[PDB]
């Protein structure tokens, strides 16, 4: 069985796909919600922050005490407060804030402190030997998710745009691009032909049956 890590009272939990990355859930406002810890040879990155700062401050303090080394980078993966909630922490600690350009105009516009805008529609990072790769694949939850791709492991974070098992319909599509959805879906399946695990923006770890479910949902 995988191990699982705990805070005091469940808020924050780490649960580890391999020996070197694991999931990080928390439960905002109840509603979970999951990113990724990365541990490097170089310092720990994470996909995504937390709903707030009091949770990313939590977050972060829990795994720099565990792996004993300091979160030094963090993917935003789209504008939303589940995603970028945490954002006014990461950047007084020193944390740089990945994201792609529309993610940060859209943090500002909503009043956040911006991430750097510095990813593109492709680009591939490198953090020790860990290799990162962020794409866009196109409007869906938002106008503005990105999806993550670990090339070493095949493992997919879809973020928001991926819908869990348990999720019986879309959810908050408010800012959602329920037209284009399917075909940045589309775009992440054509891309991505032999995928190991993915991540869903909440809810539990599945495959690429998670993408299968959010084309089903979105008929
Ligand atoms: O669906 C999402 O991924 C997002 S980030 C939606 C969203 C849309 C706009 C503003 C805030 C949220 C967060 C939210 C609010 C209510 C939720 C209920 C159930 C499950 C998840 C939920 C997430
Ligand atoms: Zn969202
Ligand atoms: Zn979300």
Not at 94 to 114: Q, R
Request: with cysteine; proline share 2%; hydrophobic share 35%.
């Amino acid at each position: 069985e995988k191990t699982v890590i705990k805070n005091e009272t469940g808020t924050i939990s780490i649960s580890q796909l391999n020996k070197n990355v694991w999931v990080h859930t928390e439960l905002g406002s109840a509603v979970p919600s999951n990113g990724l810890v990365l541990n490097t040879s170089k310092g720990l990155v994470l996909v995504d922050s937390s709903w707030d700062d009091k949770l990313t401050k939590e977050l972060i303090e829990m795994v720099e005490k565990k792996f004993q080394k300091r979160v030094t980078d963090v993917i935003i993966t789209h504008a939303h407060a589940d995603r970028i909630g945490g954002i006014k922490t990461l950047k007084e600690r020193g944390i740089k804030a990945h994201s792609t350009a529309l993610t940060a105009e859209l943090a500002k516009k909503n009043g956040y402190e911006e991430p750097l805008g510095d990813l593109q529609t492709v680009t591939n990072l490198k953090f020790g030997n860990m290799k990162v790769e962020t794409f866009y694949p196109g409007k869906g939850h938002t106008e503005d998710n990105i999806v993550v791709w670990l090339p070493q492991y095949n493992i997919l974070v879809g973020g928001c745009l991926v819908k869990s098992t348990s999720a019986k319909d879309l959810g908050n599509v408010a800012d959602a691009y329920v037209n284009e959805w399917s075909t940045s879906i589309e775009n992440v399946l054509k891309r991505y032909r032999n995928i190991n695990a993915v991540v869903p923006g909440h809810g539990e770890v599945g495959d690429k049956g998670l993408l299968l479910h959010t084309l089903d949902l979105l008929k």
